[PDB]
Amino acid sequence: RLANFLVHSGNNFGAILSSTNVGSNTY
Amino acid sequence: RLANFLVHSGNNFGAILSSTNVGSNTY
Amino acid sequence: RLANFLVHSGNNFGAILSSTNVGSNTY
Amino acid sequence: RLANFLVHSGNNFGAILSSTNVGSNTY
Amino acid sequence: RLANFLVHSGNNFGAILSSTNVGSNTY
Amino acid sequence: RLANFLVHSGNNFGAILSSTNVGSNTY
Amino acid sequence: RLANFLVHSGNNFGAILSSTNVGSNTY
Amino acid sequence: RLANFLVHSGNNFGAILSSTNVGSNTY
Amino acid sequence: RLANFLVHSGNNFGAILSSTNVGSNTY
Amino acid sequence: RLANFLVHSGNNFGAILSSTNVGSNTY
Amino acid sequence: RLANFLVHSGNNFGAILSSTNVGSNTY
Amino acid sequence: RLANFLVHSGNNFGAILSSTNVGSNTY
Amino acid sequence: RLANFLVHSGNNFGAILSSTNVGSNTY
Amino acid sequence: RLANFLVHSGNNFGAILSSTNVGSNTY
Amino acid sequence: RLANFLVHSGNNFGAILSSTNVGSNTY
Amino acid sequence: RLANFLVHSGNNFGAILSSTNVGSNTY
Amino acid sequence: RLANFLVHSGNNFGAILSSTNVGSNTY
Amino acid sequence: RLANFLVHSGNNFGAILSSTNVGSNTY
Amino acid sequence: RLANFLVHSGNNFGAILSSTNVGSNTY
Amino acid sequence: RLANFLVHSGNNFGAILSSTNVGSNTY
């Protein structure tokens, strides 16, 4: 019985320019 | 019994320019 | 019994310009 | 019985320029 | 019974330029 | 008056998400 | 008056998330 | 008046997250 | 008046996070 | 008046985090 | 003999959000 | 014989959020 | 015979957040 | 015969947050 | 015959936070 | 081949500006 | 081949500006 | 091949500015 | 090959500025 | 090959500035 939790809650990102893999969940 | 949770809740993104894989879930 | 959850709830994206894979679910 | 928690809650990011792997969860 | 907790709560990032692996959880 | 209630009394093996926008300017 | 209540009394094996925006300018 | 209450009385084996934005300018 | 209460009376084997933004300028 | 209360009376084997921003300029 | 020149030539504006008096000429 | 020159040529603005009097000419 | 030159040429602005009087000419 | 030169040429500004009178010409 | 030169050429500004009168010409 | 020429041989008391975009992605 | 020429042989009492973008990604 | 030439042979009492962007990523 | 030439042979009583960006990542 | 030449043979009573960025990461 294996449970994996990847959560993003209430996060604020003002500006994202020329970026990669920002605020993401990767399994 | 395996459960995988990838969640995005209440996240704010002001501006995204020329970016890749922003605020995404990848399995 | 395997359950996979990829969820996007209540997320705000102000502006997306020349970007790829923004706010998406990929399995 | 193994549980893995990767959580991001209430984090503020003012500006992200030419960056990689910012505020992300990687399993 | 093994539990692993990687948490980010209430963290503020003013500006991130040309950086890698900032404010992220890696398992 | 605004009342926002989320109640859970059973056994939950899935995801339960609630998003509400009242009198706001959101985009 | 604003009342935001989240109540949990059962057994939870999943994720329960609540996001609320009241009288705010969000983007 | 603003009242924000999170109550947990059962047995929790998962994640319970609550995010609230009241009268704020967020982006 | 602002009242922010987090109450836990059961047995918790997971993560319980609460984030609140009241009358603030956040980005 | 501002009242911020965190109460724990049960047995906790996990993480309980609370983040609050009242009348502040945060980024 | 009075000559006033207010000129805007070849300027690029990627994204403008919730702003005032951007790239304008005022006499 | 009075000549006043206010010129903006070839300027790039990536992202402008919640700003005032950006890249403008005022006489 | 009075000549006043206020010039902006080839200037790059990556990100401007919550700012005033950026890259402007005021007479 | 009076000549006043205020020039901005080839200047790079990575990120400007909560600032005033940045890279501007004032007469 | 009076000539006044205020010049800014090829200057790089990485990050400017909560600052005043940065990289500006004042006459 | 690309040839961009600006030639001035007379007496100029005004502003002469030239902007060119060749094979570029501009926004 | 790219040739960018600016030639001035007369008497100039004004401003002459030239901006060129060739094969570039600009925003 | 790239050739950028600025030639001035007359009498200049004003401002002559030249800005060029070739094969670059600028923002 | 890249050739950047600035030539001045007359009498200059003003400002002559040249800015060039070749094959660079600038912001 | 890169050749950057600045030549002055006349009488200069003003300012002559040259800025060049070749194959660089600048911000």
Residue numbers in the entry:
A (entry chain I), B (entry chain E), C (entry chain A), D (entry chain M), E (entry chain Q), F (entry chain C), ...: 11 to 37
Question: What does the published report state?
Answer:
Human islet amyloid polypeptide (IAPP) is a 37-residue polypeptide hormone that is co-secreted with insulin from pancreatic β cells and plays an essential role in glycemic regulation. IAPP forms amyloid deposits in the pancreas of >90% of individuals with T2D.43–45 A single genetic mutation resulting in a serine to glycine substitution at residue 20 (IAPP-S20G) is associated with familial, early-onset T2D.46,47 Recently, cryo-EM structures of IAPP amyloid fibrils assembled in vitro for the wild-type (WT)48–50 sequence and IAPP-S20G48 have been determined, as well as those of patient-seeded WT IAPP. Strikingly, the fibrils formed in the lag, growth, and plateau phases have different structures, with new forms appearing and others disappearing as fibrillation proceeds.
More surprisingly, and in marked contrast to the single structure solvable to high resolution at 3 weeks, six distinct fibril polymorphs could be identified at this time point. However, four fibril structures could be solved to high resolution (3.1–3.4 Å). Larger fibril assemblies accumulate as assembly progresses, both in terms of the average repeating crossover length of fibrils and the average number of subunits per layer of the fibril, i.e., the number of proto-filaments in each fibril form. Importantly, however, because there is a shift toward fibrils with a higher mass per unit length as assembly progresses, the larger 4PF forms have a greater total calculated stability per layer of the fibril compared with the 3PF and 2PF forms. First, we provide a molecular mechanism by which larger fibril assemblies could be formed, by accretion of subunits that dock against the preformed surfaces of their predecessors.
